[PDB]
Structures are given as structure tokens and as C-alpha cells.
Design a binder for this molecule. Structure first.
Ligand SMILES: [Fe+3]
Ligand SMILES: [Fe+3]
Length: 180
């Protein structure tokens, strides 16, 4: 917090590593594997560094302090990163990922089938599928399309076999983000 950029990043990596002991409900992976797969799909797609970091860190709220997770984890994680010095763009992509879930479900009921048990279970209490009115305001966000991409990777980052790079692969990216 008053730390150097390098030490702030070491704290984040330590929190990510600790998340391996947190289960991801409904699939044969843990929270660390989930985070890493999301970042991997982002980077492999050719996404910019802010998108990759948002994907890596979208669930940070679950473990920067549950079974299904932390209430309002999307805000907890975004605000923590705001405090550390991350850009508003990254913070908003992360904060928006629950609304993105509600939007996608409201648009096509078929999207429900894509949801893990964890994502499906929290949805009711997060407001369920969006209103027509809610959809309109979400679509008005400047990062509307990017929020949806973050959520697509979120739904995809639950593969059983998949080997992906660990947190150190993103250290330099995070340090540069903070400097920039
Ligand atoms: Fe989440
Ligand atoms: Fe997630």
C-alpha cells in the first residue's frame, strides 16, 4: 500500500498463490487455476495488458479478505486494486463482471447452462437476470463489449487438464501497469 510497486505485486502474487487452497465449486479446479486460465485465454486472444490483468484478477475479491465466495467480491476486488494504484479501466472491468453475468443470462436463457455451480448459485442474490431497463444501462457503459469478453473468459476458465503459466508470468506486466 505504501509499498514499492514491486512489493505490491509480490503481495498480489502471494494472494493468488494462497487461492490454490480455495475450491472452485462445481468443477475439478481450484481458484488459482481459475484465475490463471482466464488470464491465459485473455493473453492468447491478443488482448491488451489491461484486459489480461483484469482477467487474471477478476475474482481477487474472493481472497483479498467463503465457499461460493465473498459477498460483492466484484467491488471488494476492484476497490482493493484501486487502492494499490491500478487503472480505473482494470478496476471497472473487474467490478462489472457480475453485471456481465446477469446481462448474458437475461439475453439468452441458454447462457444459464454455461454457468458453473458457483456462478449460478450467487446469481439469484446478485439480482438474477437483468431487467430490460438494466440491460439498457449496462449496454451504455463505455467498456460494455470488453466486460462481456472478460465474462466469456470467466466461463471458459474451468478446464480440467489445462496447463497454463503461473502468476510470475504476469509480474512484469503488473509492475509496468502500476508504473504507467
Ligand atoms: Fe466472480
Ligand atoms: Fe471467475
Amino acid at each position: 500500500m505504501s509499498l514499492s510497486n514491486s512489493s505490491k505485486v509480490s503481495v498480489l502474487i502471494s494472494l493468488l498463490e494462497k487461492s490454490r487452497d480455495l475450491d472452485y465449486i462445481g468443477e475439478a479446479i481450484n481458484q488459482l487455476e481459475h484465475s490463471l486460465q482466464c488470464a491465459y485465454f485473455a493473453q492468447r486472444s491478443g488482448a491488451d495488458n489491461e484486459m489480461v490483468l483484469a482477467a487474471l484478477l477478476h475474482d481477487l475479491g474472493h481472497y483479498c479478505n467463503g465457499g461460493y465466495g465473498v459477498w460483492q467480491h466484484e467491488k471488494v476486488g476492484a476497490d482493493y486494486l484501486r487502492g494499490l494504484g491500478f487503472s480505473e479501466r482494470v478496476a471497472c472491468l473487474i467490478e462489472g463482471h457480475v453485471a456481465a453475468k446477469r446481462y448474458l443470462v437475461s439475453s439468452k436463457a441458454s447462457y444459464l447452462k454455461n454457468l458453473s455451480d458457483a456462478s449460478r448459485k450467487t446469481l439469484e442474490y446478485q439480482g438474477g437476470p437483468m431487467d430490460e431497463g438494466e440491460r439498457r444501462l449496462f449496454e451504455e457503459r463505455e467498456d460494455f463489449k470488453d466486460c462481456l469478453k472478460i465474462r466469456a473468459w470467466d466461463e471458459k476458465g474451468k478446464q480440467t487438464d489445462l496447463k497454463v503459466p503461473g502468476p510470475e508470468h504476469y509480474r512484469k506486466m503488473m509492475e509496468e501497469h502500476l508504473s504507467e
